[PDB]
Amino acid sequence: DSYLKHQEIVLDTLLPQTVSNQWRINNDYIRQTCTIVEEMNIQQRKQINDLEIYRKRL
Amino acid sequence: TSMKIQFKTAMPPTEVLLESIQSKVESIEQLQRKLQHVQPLEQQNNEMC
């Protein structure tokens, strides 16, 4: 019965190690998403500016 | 005679063991079920990792 408790705890340690590295990868992705999403926002604003600018010139 | 003598001893040895060991079986068997869930989560986390 004691052996089975040593066997069990080992599995749940790996559950945490996987849990941490899985959340850690997603954590890095998050920053990337927010980096570019801003850059795309910057692009679209500039896009809309030309769109009306070119009209108001003509 | 043997069947009588032996199986009476067996039933006494069994029920004496069972009283002590059915509790320890449940202890040991409910722990086994924990491996079967500790494993099944392990794979989904590895897969998702």
UniProtKB/Swiss-Prot annotation, chain A:
Coiled-coil zones: none
Annotated compartments: Nucleus
Subunit (UniProt): Belongs to the NTC complex (or PRP19-associated complex), composed of at least CEF1, CLF1, ISY1, NTC20, SNT309, SYF1, SYF2, and PRP19.
Purpose: Involved in pre-mRNA splicing by stabilizing the NTC (or PRP19-associated complex). As a component of the NTC complex, associates to the spliceosome to mediate conformational rearrangement or to stabilize the structure of the spliceosome after U4 snRNA dissociation, which leads to spliceosome maturation.
Miscellaneous comment text of the record: Present with 721 molecules/cell in log phase SD medium.
Protein name, as recorded: Pre-mRNA-splicing factor SNT309
Gene, per the UniProt record: SNT309
Part of the whole protein covered: 118 to 175 of 175
Curated annotation (Swiss-Prot), chain B:
Further information: Present with 784 molecules/cell in log phase SD medium.
Subcellular location: Cytoplasm; Nucleus
Sequence similarity: Belongs to the CEF1 family.
Subunit record text: Belongs to the NTC complex (or PRP19-associated complex), composed of at least CEF1, CLF1, ISY1, NTC20, SNT309, SYF1, SYF2, and PRP19.
Protein's job: Involved in pre-mRNA splicing and cell cycle control. Required for the binding of the NTC complex (or PRP19-associated complex) components to the spliceosome to mediate conformational rearrangement or to stabilize the structure of the spliceosome after U4 snRNA dissociation, which leads to spliceosome maturation. Its absence leads to an arrest of the cell cycle, possibly due to the inefficient splicing of TUB1.
Disulfides per UniProt: none
Protein name: Pre-mRNA-splicing factor CEF1
Domain of life per record: Eukaryota
Species name: Saccharomyces cerevisiae (strain ATCC 204508 / S288c) (Baker's yeast)
